[PDB]
Amino acid sequence: SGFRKMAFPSGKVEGCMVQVTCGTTTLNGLWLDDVVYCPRHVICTSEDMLNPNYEDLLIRKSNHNFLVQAGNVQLRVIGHSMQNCVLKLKVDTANPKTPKYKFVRIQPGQTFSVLACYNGSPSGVYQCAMRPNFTIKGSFLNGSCGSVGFNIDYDCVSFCYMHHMELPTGVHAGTDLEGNFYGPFVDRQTAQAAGTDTTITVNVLAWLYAAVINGDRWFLNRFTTTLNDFNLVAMKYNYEPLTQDHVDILGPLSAQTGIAVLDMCASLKELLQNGMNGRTILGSALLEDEFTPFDVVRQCSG
Amino acid sequence: SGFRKMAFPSGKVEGCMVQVTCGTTTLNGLWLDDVVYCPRHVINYEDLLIRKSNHNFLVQAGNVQLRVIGHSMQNCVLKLKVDTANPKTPKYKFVRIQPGQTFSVLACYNGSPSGVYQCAMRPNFTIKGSFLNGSCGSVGFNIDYDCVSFCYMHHMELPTGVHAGTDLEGNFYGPFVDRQTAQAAGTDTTITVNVLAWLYAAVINGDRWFLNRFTTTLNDFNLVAMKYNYEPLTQDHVDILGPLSAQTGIAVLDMCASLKELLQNGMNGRTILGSALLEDEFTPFDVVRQCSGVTF
Ligand SMILES: CN1C(=O)N(c2cncc3ccccc23)C(=O)[C@@]12CCOc1ccc(Cl)cc12
Ligand SMILES: [Cl-]
């Protein structure tokens, strides 16, 4: 019993964190096999932040301009290439601690763990969700660039995020491990703003099923709804549209608790209308949207 | 910017998790140097233990079986002497924590780490964890520089879904015993110094709506706090909050008047750091660590 915001154990990722220094900029790199992946903005100077020409800045760099530190050991850079917004530094040593890994690009609503690092040193681990507006509500200070988001399947680490920047609202933007940004963001200091954020509906429903599995039924009601009527109500509270894919995804939790997805949608409509009335659901006074249907099954069942 | 419930990186502890099997029971063990620490319920514990031989305890570290060469009991923890010192043993200490202190929990099943979360030792000595069958032996810890301070070992779940465990010396936190019997968590209270620390974290992150011009005496605050099932705030807590008070320019008794207004009037549709409830599982140290960037 119990329901916590749970991160994956970070050990497999900690053994990959390195410090990358180019000129005055220092940030984090991900050392997998003989390559160090880091945000390409590590090559940027003071007058380069607004309109950097990364191809032009990179061609002027030599391997010895990139200082890579793994613990108290300096790795020797023997090559460099750019792939979208990530810089790939070929090093002369394969990381002996390289786990079984994959680069996966995630969709909004998907969750992952963040290993926050400064100067190639892991300082903390927490759980995140890719917001529908493609930002993440992280916990990052200056020097956290290059910190990574990941999930762990069996013994395999799926790297899904690399931290690049903070938007003016305090939310965070970054790329997948192939350097493709999530959202309409660019690695420039030009005026950028996160779009209006919405609640991840399928995740709230998954969390309502987690509450039912943990013995909380107070929010359930005798009603059901059509998917269309639920979406008409949901959009009014800035909730993401619930698709037939989401209904299908919620099938196992529905079978386990005996509460049909559209029946759970009717509880959610009522919670949106009434609020909680001094009550909590799984120790929360707000509807939690950073647990996927997959997280609920993993945590509540195994 | 940002404020998240953040756990310590778990790598140093993951390299210590082993599976312990005795008869039909399988749970987790903590392998440090040549000893595997695990809950004694894996086996009258003196009478049950004397009937066991070393080969009755099957200890598995990855796909490698460690051979048990000795066994002794210390309070509610079983110490299995093994033939091999764990090469991954980090610099460590066994520390007993006080209620209100936080720690990271590496939840394990069959000696395999599955998740990490940040917890607080509730004033009623329980933890509001997330544990399923097989999680026994999962450990709580903090990291100070490169030293892992082991502070908790999971033993059981109470009927309310909350958890009970011991320090690494086998001494239970709270009035609990390791047996299937009628046990209940006492009435819980809010960790006041931690709520204030979290209110300072909100100020550091740009949330000031709850601030007011008012101040209070420590006595008046404790009279109000006692009414709302909040732990008494001591002069030690006020002193501990000193750095955050200096950084934000809000005296501790000034934040206490904010907390008093929040307790009597509520949030009024508003949130603080994305929460509609007053969060009490971040200590003043956690707030400073997260709002400064301390690494391990
Ligand atoms: C070099 N940068 C950088 O390290 N962060 C930051 C990341 N994450 C959290 C932070 C918190 C406090 C200050 C800066 C933080 C940025 O946002 C920034 C500086 C600001 O403009 C940009 C623009 C583009 C790009 Cl890709 C990076 C940046
Ligand atoms: Cl995804």
XYZ file of C-alpha atoms and ligand atoms in Angstrom, chain A residues 41 49 54 140-145 163-167 172 181 186-189 192, chain B residues 1, ligand 1:
50
model
C 25.108 25.596 -26.347
C 23.285 33.597 -26.925
C 26.369 26.589 -34.117
C 17.066 23.180 -12.051
C 19.591 25.903 -11.235
C 22.423 27.363 -13.390
C 24.878 24.579 -14.317
C 22.175 21.888 -14.560
C 22.319 21.891 -18.423
C 18.098 19.609 -20.073
C 18.857 22.730 -22.120
C 17.088 25.815 -20.688
C 14.649 27.531 -18.369
C 11.750 29.560 -19.775
C 12.115 23.840 -18.411
C 13.772 19.771 -28.864
C 15.165 26.805 -29.822
C 18.532 26.916 -28.033
C 18.726 30.753 -28.406
C 18.127 33.463 -25.769
C 10.343 32.248 -26.008
C 13.845 27.565 -10.485
C 22.769 28.798 -20.599
N 21.462 28.662 -19.959
C 21.264 27.881 -18.860
O 22.113 27.225 -18.286
N 19.918 27.989 -18.509
C 19.319 27.368 -17.347
C 18.814 26.074 -17.393
N 18.124 25.494 -16.401
C 17.907 26.209 -15.303
C 18.355 27.541 -15.115
C 18.098 28.284 -13.935
C 18.559 29.562 -13.806
C 19.286 30.159 -14.830
C 19.550 29.481 -15.986
C 19.094 28.148 -16.172
C 19.218 28.822 -19.395
O 18.017 29.011 -19.402
C 20.266 29.413 -20.382
C 20.434 30.901 -20.025
C 19.236 31.698 -20.493
O 19.054 31.624 -21.923
C 19.233 30.391 -22.508
C 18.782 30.292 -23.813
C 18.927 29.097 -24.492
C 19.519 28.025 -23.856
Cl 19.514 26.468 -24.642
C 20.013 28.120 -22.567
C 19.850 29.310 -21.856
